[PDB]
Symmetry: D2
Subunit: 336 residues, 4 copies
């Protein structure tokens, strides 16, 4: 059974733990967490969550170097520097890197220095880091990869259906805009930030900001290299986001044919990854959905027979986290 370590017990770190906790017969086993905030803080923020609600499990605090969840305990380490982490001592097989600071080979490699065997970054990698999106190119994964990236939340929402669109209609070019819930990277009130837009009060504005999803899609789907670009619009919601993709395709089509193409994948190769919703819902209704992307069938439009517009919802926190568990499961099941 794969011994897992969670580096950075934040939104994704905690969502990951709770997603894993819900899996039946998991090949993973979370033995340690690195929360630079304290054992008591880890147990408290794990039990009480403003987004997921109160954790339906017995969350207690063990000694002062570990917490308890439904009985099974998990040690709690604390060190802003990976090289010191007791990964080697504990024999950590995989480190879930969710700090948002160690994304390049050197930064993430430190976990390896500490004694870890593998590292899975819960974000896009930097400079030669194999990226994988479950349902798109996960089959290209090999146990030889010591450092891997699960891409971004937007990329995991877009890639699945872009793959279907390209395969069935052939994308020529396109553009995307994601109306995204605010995240920890933004500021509560106008404050310093390298990105002068993200520096503005998050709950008060619609804030345009760059996104890497467009180019990231090209990584997991080589055929899209240089065909897409896009932006993000952060808005006053705490979780759940939506992507608006517009593409010109080679084969003429219409809205209902596109929707059917999505349903076919949803019922087959993309079951559990892509879903198609025919009800008139809103963002709050997609909270805690396990899929990576949900097409709002009713909003699909086709202009001039070859300009397709698709609207897809995604729980950037929970949905993405389920994909982290899936990739971790792959790393385990394909362990040699």
């Amino acid at each position: 059974k794969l011994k897992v370590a969670i580096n950075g017990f934040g939104r994704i770190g905690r969502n990951f733990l709770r997603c894993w906790h819900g899996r039946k017969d998991s090949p993973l086993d979370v033995v340690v967490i690195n929360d630079t905030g304290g054992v008591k803080q880890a147990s408290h923020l794990l039990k009480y969550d403003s987004i997921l609600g109160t954790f339906d499990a017995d969350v207690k605090t063990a000694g002062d170097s570990a917490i308890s969840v439904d009985g099974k305990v998990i040690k709690v380490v604390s060190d802003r520097n990976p090289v010191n982490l007791p990964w080697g001592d504990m024999g950590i097989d995989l480190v879930i890197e969710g700090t948002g600071v160690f994304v390049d080979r050197d930064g993430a490699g430190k976990h390896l220095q500490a004694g870890a065997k593998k590292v899975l970054i819960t974000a896009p990698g930097k400079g030669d880091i194999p990226t994988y999106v479950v349902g798109v190119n996960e089959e290209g994964y090999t146990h030889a990869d010591t450092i891997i990236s699960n891409a971004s939340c937007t990329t995991n929402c877009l890639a699945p259906f872009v793959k279907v669109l390209d395969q069935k209609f052939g994308i020529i070019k396109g553009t995307m805009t994601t109306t995204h819930s605010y995240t920890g990277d933004q500021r509560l009130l106008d404050a310093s930030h390298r990105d002068l837009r993200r520096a503005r009060a998050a709950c008060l504005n619609i804030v345009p900001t760059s996104t890497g999803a467009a180019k990231a899609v090209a990584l997991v789907l080589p055929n899209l290299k240089g065909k897409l670009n896009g932006i993000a619009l952060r808005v006053p919601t705490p979780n759940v986001s939506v992507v608006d993709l517009v593409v010109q395709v080679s084969k003429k089509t219409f809205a209902e044919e596109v929707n059917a193409a999505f349903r076919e994948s949803a019922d087959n190769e993309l079951k559990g990854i892509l879903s198609v919703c025919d009800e008139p819902l809103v963002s709050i209704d997609f909270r805690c959905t396990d899929v990576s992307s949900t097409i709002d069938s009713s909003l699909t439009m086709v202009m001039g027979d070859d300009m397709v517009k698709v609207i897809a919802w995604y729980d950037n926190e929970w949905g993405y986290s389920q994909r982290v568990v899936d990739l971790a499961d792959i790393v385990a099941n394909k362990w040699q």
Copy 2:
């Protein structure tokens, strides 16, 4: 001097009054208001505004059938039925219809029955109603028109630059999505509404909803008939919205050429209607801007040489209201 009457003292009704108050040497003269809420309520909500801030003017309450603003008084009527209104008695020349309920010829025509000479609907008209967008087709207006529409806020933001795009590059087809601030039509908490999405808590969700701007553009710009479609995404902000337009054009171009095309119009035929912003701002920064549309130059993108994506900001309340005053001014200056 044109005698004006404001029917429905709501967001637009009040914004209109304050916009007019700020104009220098106005050809209009607001003599009466129809607030089914009371003289005291009119004066209070006119003086104190959660969006515009406290009205910098002496707002008092006269008798009980009129209010006072910086000295000049304005009578206050109250009747949910236009046919009864004392328009004839007062000799009302133009009625600013901002109730949101009298948009067809029959409904708005009642103001005419009451004795009003003209009616200007602060919203899209229904069934054979001449619609005008200042800076696009206002020249087609004639004093013979007894009932006219100033279209919607989104239409006033989109039309101006779509006109420039079509004239300079030739639009083949396109799609639009407006991330719009919530409005009075939505619900504070999940409650009844014909639109099951707009029925959901407005400050808590991203709510997809239909928009008529796409087809409305075709009204003021015949050449666009059947070339555009789009949707709206209402989000948790009280005012200021943004439109994301994607179009395939006939002439190949690039981002900087498109921006320059917009600047040229902004400095000329569209001065005061269209503006181009080169700073990294957010929605809050566009509050109280007088223009109908402001291009976020830095976000303009061109894919595959002919797929143009443009992001434009607009103060749906204040910006639109300034356009209502402009159209009213036209009705006055062109009065025969």
Copy 3:
């Protein structure tokens, strides 16, 4: 087997139904709902809720005048005029008045004229209407009462622990302030309203407003007559509120003792009604709590040995609805 009818399928009406649905061996049978919005709306808003999340039950429309919940079919009617409802024809024993418009005898009386045998107003009754707060004075209820009131959510949170305070320390005089979540009665954006403060944008302000909870407590707790007063502060949160009580007691005490008095009562006389939380929690953590009041023990203070300050949380929608169910249960248990 009380035949129950729900008049007004709003926040409380829907919370009521879901609360009732979760009870085991209920003496109530909800057979009809009067939803002026129609069958599709009732089914949709019952299934999807921005606060409660998606109803974990099979909810769907049944024909054109009913809906089903896990196979249980419930008739749906639509009439704003209570006198025309088919209560007598259907043999309705109890009507749950959750409209907020028929809170007086002449109004609620309309249901009796329509044939209903009794009415329970989900709010303070207006005039000489018997009001009951479960855990405080319900034993005073009599089958002879044809129209009763369950009081407000605020009164239901306050009364319970004030009963404990008065019984063990003796309240001489006091004042309270409730920091209440916004409700449908408030305005989304500055709009007409009897209360010039409730007329202001709800998600943007701290809105002071009157409250009758202080006086209402004297109806269920005769001893407190003329001893308490209070006001309310509506803040930008969708659900869950909190009461701040300051009372001068006859018996000198201290914080630890006061909390002790609350715990013993919560473990006996007020079990299931009053609770005491020793955790450093926030509003969202109290969502969907079945009790009527939860004392935040760490906030209890006592100044000069006799001035006590108590802070208690309460889910104004769900917690109160559980109480409506309980009061309805009492009506059934004492039915003659």
Copy 4:
């Protein structure tokens, strides 16, 4: 001609500068700003503000180490270590400590080591640091104080009217609760924090937290020593807060009399510091008010002739910053 340096260009630092900029014949000369974010950021965030709106002044960068405001050039430096600041070299007379990190003697002392002649902490000082509240005890300030504190926004709103209450009615004991807007110290989304409640999503909860304002009032008002206590409730509003005071007074009185006492003081001893509003207003209406406290007269209540409840509003950012300017003005006026 006091040479002033602003350390920490945050909400208060920027509000300070804008407040100072609006004063006529100021004895202060802001010559330098230490903004760890850099020159472009300082210029940008000073010009664009989500709360104050766009600064009506020509703001722009000047070279690579300064900015200008209407032609007035201000040097900008960037160092997180106060000891390395060029205070002595520049001849800085007074440092405005708005970082929130150097509030103790050893910390603020670092500025003195760097050559500054005096430090004014924009917050409660930690330890034996003289604290002053303009309108309450400023006359006690002496040029000999090298490090002083202007107290918190809450203490500045409370002290003024509590001085009036104590002087005309005699306060025996009391308790207060402040419904405060969120601040940068809180978390955007559930994240690490010393205070497990402040760690919770700020725009989503009512967050209780400790306050030292009650005790701080005793520092500027010796008479109230050990007579008051209190707590704070952080709510989802960006700016403007309100204090709820409940005191037991020695002199029996009534609401109208208490308000009368406040008005006479606001017209004399506390003019420009304390104000009384007789309008039914909401938080947003008190934005950018220069006074430190505004009593909401219609909310004043008196229970049992001696229990008084007072509610006062205060712009925690702007109102308090005007006070920092005034205290700075005093430092200049008493300079030796």
